[model samples]
Target: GSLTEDGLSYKEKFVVRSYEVGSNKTATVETIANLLQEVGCNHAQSVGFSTDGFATTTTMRKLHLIWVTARMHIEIYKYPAWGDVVEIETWCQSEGRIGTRRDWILKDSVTGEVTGRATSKWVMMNQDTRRLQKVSDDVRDEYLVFCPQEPRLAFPEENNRSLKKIPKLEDPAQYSMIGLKPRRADLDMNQHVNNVTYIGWVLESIPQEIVDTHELQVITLDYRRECQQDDVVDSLTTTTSDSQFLHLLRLSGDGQEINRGTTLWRKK
Candidate 1:
């Protein structure tokens, strides 16, 4: 692991694999999420706040605590291919009272060219009660020791890289989709569907022609609710333009939206 001089971020390298690539032969968004989860946990462990360390996972579990992602914004400049090695760096800071903001920067390990950036917000929750938990001063202090003096914000106000709001589909009754069903493997440790799975579902709604000819430029996901095992969902999309799309995932059972997202694409 490589730590920045100021200890503001932790960096590591990963090699893309055939299994990680999609139909386009480049790494998929789901693959990127997997990497992000890896580095985020690695950063936690490095600072002695890992699920099994000082701020141990067991300790948190015993206290009925868990972190849940509230929102994620990702931008891709390029995708790595199989056998390509990419470097990833990540860091986090407190967000007001009850949220933690995490960011990542990805680059080609060889050329040193940045490939992408991401910013996400997470909030703590009570495992049993399933309600948001405020970041108490004590909990904040426990993690503050590991943060840098001047924290880095991936999407600074000046840069304004934050995600734009994606509205609910105007006519909820009208939508097209490529259907999806959650399998046992899609479930995460929390016994609910993982967020990355939703990204794949969002992409599934895009026409194959678009997917074949366009490169995903930006994506913003707002997770509304969690899906469980065996729950069938619809990956619905509305093409806002030739190069942009809006997507929504709804539980087929009750037609309730589980997540919504917007995607911008550029011709390859």
Candidate 2:
């Protein structure tokens, strides 16, 4: 049941999944990407592939169901997430405007229930003009066909959150980091370090002592800065008195901030 059901999404447009690989604990990006391809009707880099903000992810960060509001794609001006079942949705709804309104809904794979969701407004940019632009009427008319009826909510606490007060550490500690060269695998369509790459780095950064005895508990990362190919970066590790250890990323040459994310570890 597990194997057949797991591979089932490869045939259908939408897939249900769980965390299996690419993580020490239960979290999966590949599975989520496959499901996103099925429901969203586009690949990650597609011109219309960006989703409405109401997407959801599991407690373990395994699955993320991301969708868009129909009006953001069609000019329909209805409730958001009207475009979840539709395909080829655009990020622009209005003609000659600045940005688009979008939303998403996330569900758990094991239980087929809502886990998290979010709504975010975005601006469409002209690749050639290097600036924000309005959607042409033609584009708006083309999308909006697959909007979902009710915009599912990505959990508010799980995503799109304001920075929580940084917890204090009882025994503060620090360690140095080495910047990684942007290899081909690190580059995404946006020409920067992909967000998932940060997760990979987090697992890879854990001390052998911790990795050998502890399991990953939880993780959270925000896209604060973009990293490009050939950019030198510095890595730092800090263990606060609160017993949380953070792996910090920064520019190697100028010390610009890249990402300040944390991963918690506990004995399995």
Candidate 3:
């Protein structure tokens, strides 16, 4: 079923604002993520689904489920320069009985060349119990009514498998980072820091040499816990090799791991 005005997919044009750019005047990783969030939320609202709407339904019959991001994999072919307008398209499809997958493609509106592509996995949490719930028949039926008929994933099956193989940061010599203090603006409606902010924090720790000489090509993040306002986080990165890097964010207070990721870069 096509809920969006443009068909099963939602599309929007964005001008890379000055504030969204990094020191080099290219759109930063977090800026791209924020755009994805905007399109995803808009699509859900168009399909008659939302966190607020689901809350009301759960109060009535407990038939509602809350969507939460599980994992994100992004591949950036080029970073949009400042003042460049980019077109982004997003859609969702069912992923078996317990998950849903969303995909996005970003293109330079002028050149018509792809700038980036991403796919993310989301699972449902029961509102009343605050626990993950499987896609029941009714829930699946509800979503399938709005899901696209043909699926489009940004990565092939093999590439997706590589994303799952993020390495753990275990060497003490490889761990070094700057501390971050979360502000009110960093927290979302759930009272926890947003996933995109974690990506920004991770990027903060990558060596300047890499940032200046290379472009980020691929990234995969798996979130482990919710970070609160009071938490002091250490954003750490370690080079796996010449082309691969490992990132981890943890609580400075008690050493709890919040998130870990892997990034691959190529010379610009």
Candidate 4:
């Protein structure tokens, strides 16, 4: 398949594999996240903005810059079973000068029934300095022209309150999982732990009962700081409601926050 007529969007097809499924025989949340990211990067490469198959542009590479996700909210309506074919469409739009937004729509290739929707924002980061950077004009121009003139957001104004503010969990959390550390395989090309790895840590601290009896319907993550391979992490969560949980990832040594998250679940 090719980019849309206006070259504003790209679609990727994925065959759900056995290895991507969990005990329920449906695709895991992490697998879906990886598919979304893969499609996003492929969209970038198709537009001539990427040189190494990543979402980072060649101009950004020369400047030692990369895109780091700042926030993401995903709502899943269905989980494709193994051997199911799903096609995801992705597009990007300019966000407040220094940031950019990407959104995705996932559907079954056979039935064309939507399975999920997600939206996220990313900011430029200097690889060498390990600091967030304001997007330079050169970098913005590399992709802005390819974006649609009228930006499309999956979560529009009236219905947008769906992603509620995630509260900061306090100490003495009801559930806590400690001694988490990243491995070399966990690091992205930017040398920091990838976004989905942090999500794994967030869910690790939840009570096993919820994990076994509930299906994750929505997850919102606000990444605060990068996590290095050597840093030890702790996952903590508190019940905000009968079907909701607020999670926090922190450095084990000094308690610096890594990511703030909230999840909504449905009884299985």
Using lDDT as the measure, the top candidate is 4
Q: TM-scores of all models?
A: 0.90, 0.50, 0.89, 0.92
If both were scored by TM-score, which would come out higher, candidate 3 or candidate 4?
4
Kindly report which residue stretches of model 3 are placed more than 4 angstroms away from their true locations once superposed: 1-6, 51-64, 127-130, 159-163, 173-175
| lDDT for position 145 in model 2 | 41
lDDT of 1 by residue, 1-268 (tens): 7677878789999999899998878899889988988888787777666542113354565787877887889988999998999999988887667687889999999999999999998888886787887877766766676665475777777545465668886555234664588787887665677678888888887878888898888898998887768778888888787398778888876789989888899998
Q: Which 10 successive residues of model 3 have the least lDDT summed? A: 51-60
lDDT of 4 by residue, 82-163 (tens): 9999999988899766798889999989999989999998888886787887777777877778887685987777546345
Candidate 1 positional error at 127, Å: 1.6
Give all candidate RMSDs, comma-separated. Answer: 2.5, 12.1, 2.9, 2.0
Error of 4 at 16 (Å): 0.8
lDDT of 2 by residue, 1-268 (tens): 0111322111122333233333343324333323332343332223333432222222111222222221110111111121122111112122124444343344444445443332334444433433444555654444444332333332234433322433322222366647666687766554656445555554455566766666544454543455667787665667653135766666778877666656555565
lDDT of 3 by residue, 1-268 (tens): 1245645788788889989998779998889999888777776676556543121233224554567777888988888999999889888888887688888999999988988999988777764676887777766776675667666677768555435766668756264676787898887786767778888887888888888998888888987776778878888888888488888888887779988898899987
Q: Looking at candidate 4, what is the lDDT of residue 223?
A: 91
lDDT of 3 at 154: 71
